[PDB]
Write an enzyme that holds these catalytic residues in place. Structure first.
Site, PDB file in Angstrom:
ATOM      1  N   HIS A 148      -0.021   8.070  10.548  1.00  8.14           N
ATOM      2  CA  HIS A 148      -1.112   8.223  11.493  1.00  8.14           C
ATOM      3  C   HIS A 148      -1.838   6.641  11.339  1.00  8.14           C
ATOM      4  CE1 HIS A 148      -4.190   8.574   8.251  1.00  8.14           C
ATOM      5  NE2 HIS A 148      -3.582   9.633   7.906  1.00  8.14           N
ATOM      6  N   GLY A 207      -9.915   9.625  -3.410  1.00  2.00           N
ATOM      7  CA  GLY A 207      -8.584   8.986  -2.884  1.00  2.00           C
ATOM      8  C   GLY A 207      -8.778   9.384  -1.575  1.00  2.00           C
ATOM      9  N   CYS A 218      -6.407   8.428   2.533  1.00  3.41           N
ATOM     10  CA  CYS A 218      -5.078   8.493   2.946  1.00  3.41           C
ATOM     11  C   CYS A 218      -4.003   7.416   2.377  1.00  3.41           C
ATOM     12  CB  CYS A 218      -5.017   8.382   4.569  1.00  3.41           C
ATOM     13  SG  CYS A 218      -6.288   9.205   5.366  1.00  3.41           S
TER      14      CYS A 218
END
Ligand SMILES: NC(=O)c1ccnc(Cl)c1
Lengths: 300, 304
Positions: free
Chosen positions: A41, A143, A145
């Protein structure tokens, strides 16, 4: 108390983290040999993320659309392909820090370490389990992606998880390194929620075995239960049903402590129905469910 | 929001992994920390198990020469060309500077402050965890076999601040050690004599930081409309084994108080009610327990 939860040393994975940029979007990539892995993505625009045709969008982007930085060193993308939900960027230089590694798929309830990263830079490491609803607990500050989860076995890194999205309920969801999601989640901007979560029963039993090995024995009782009778009770308390496989996985700890699995199950059943009555187990007032049976074997 | 479901993290341990080595004196093996041309390890490596009741470290060390010390980094044997003692830390000078030496500092921490420990055995990193120096100057560590010489650290902008080295397990299951200058934390000695850690207490200022982080994330169920005096708070808190709060702790929480508009003593009154009522199956930031190992320094940074 004793027993502290530990993550794996993260140095072998730190050496693989890079920054991938496509257009405005920047996230983390995993650089192994001459390939960089990241969520597909990254290639999406605001118009695209409401219903994207990824493979169509992918084949019509040039390699120069992708900006890969390893520290202050630019990797040149010389190719790109899609494997399910992971983007694979071929670069002209192999990562000299590439460890011995494998891509593996894990099961809900199994544990791994996550190296939380931002913009390709490692920020911290933590130990977690795949929840039964296929999410991982963690915040936006655990964290972003492209951060990855892994186990280390001998000198070999088993990558098992890549972060794709943070859900609004303080959990994240992702894929294995082959791009297959864990759980019924999709990588587009669109209304998604995690199912109701449950407690990982086999891990709770593993943790009670660890408590016995540490001489914390007050909860042991003289009773045994049937696997079904336990499940009837466990499911009422949103505990995961215990399978015969789970019983088998606990076999070594039973022989190692002398407490049969369905013996420990009668202890846990009584704990669920009556609580701990002001007592602790391994110094905690809460039952721990993110230690696998194997985690216990290794640490204990 | 930002901290919903927050998990404590250890610092990434790679920079420290590159410094771990195996130190052997005679029959004793433990971990050392190799920085530039010096390996640091607990001086009790020079003890036999007889010696550990009443070791005379000056007498034992004078009898050692450089070749009595076996230092191994992987499959490479480092040559010891000097040795000296600094408090309870042994310093072995070697003929090779560690090429993997990060930028680093030695710093002494205070109880309540947090750091990561890289748990090692025979020079090999086994696991990493995040913790706080407990008020009674112990740390709650791993199951642990021979992790002496494992170190605790923080990392700030790729500079590694070393603050702890593991020396002993107390009978209580907890662990005691020194800073990297060899000075113990707490009233402990590197000696296998009857030593007991004091009653441990909750790090109140850290819990308050955590509650402020929860409010910044819209988790407000535990707030009440009361305030308290500082002394009324400490009378209650001590009676739950919470550390007494000082005006220093009040000042430290100032930025969080201004960011939320909740005075510190107002939040102290909420904590007092939480202690009274308990968290029985309720969560704050997704955790069923009151967290006391996340500091104001961390909260203020992560909630700018
Ligand atoms: N006096 C109090 O505010 C109080 C605080 C905590 N617990 C109890 Cl029972 C009372």
């Amino acid at each position: 108390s004793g027993f502290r939860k530990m993550a794996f040393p993260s140095g072998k994975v730190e050496g693989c983290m890079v920054q991938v940029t496509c257009g405005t979007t920047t996230l983390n990539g995993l650089w192994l040999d001459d390939v960089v892995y990241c969520p597909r993505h990254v290639i999406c625009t605001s118009e695209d993320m409401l219903n994207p045709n990824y493979e169509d969008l992918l084949i019509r982007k040039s390699n120069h659309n992708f900006l890969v930085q390893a520290g202050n060193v630019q990797l040149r993308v010389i190719g790109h392909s899609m494997q399910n939900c992971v983007l694979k960027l071929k670069v002209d230089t192999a990562n000299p820090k590439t460890p011995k590694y494998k891509f593996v798929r894990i099961q809900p309830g199994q544990t791994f370490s996550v190296l939380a990263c931002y913009n390709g830079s490692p920020s911290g490491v933590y130990q977690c389990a795949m929840r039964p609803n296929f999410t991982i607990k963690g915040s936006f500050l655990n964290g972003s992606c492209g951060s990855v989860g892994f186990n280390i076995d001998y000198d070999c890194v088993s990558f098992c998880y890549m972060h794709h999205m943070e859900l609004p309920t303080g959990v994240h969801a992702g894929t294995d390194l082959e791009g297959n999601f864990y759980g019924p989640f999709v990588d587009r901007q669109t209304a998604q929620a995690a199912g109701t979560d449950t407690t990982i029963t086999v891990n709770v039993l593993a943790w009670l075995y660890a408590a016995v090995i540490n001489g914390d024995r007050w909860f042991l009782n003289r009773f045994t239960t049937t696997l079904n009778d336990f499940n009837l009770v466990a499911m009422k308390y949103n505990y995961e049903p215990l399978t015969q496989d789970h019983v088998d996985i606990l076999g070594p700890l039973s022989a190692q402590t002398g407490i049969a699995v369905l013996d420990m199950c009668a202890s846990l059943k009584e704990l669920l129905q009556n609580g701990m009555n002001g007592r602790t187990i391994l110094g905690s007032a809460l039952l721990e469910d993110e230690f696998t049976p194997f985690d216990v074997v290794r640490q204990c």
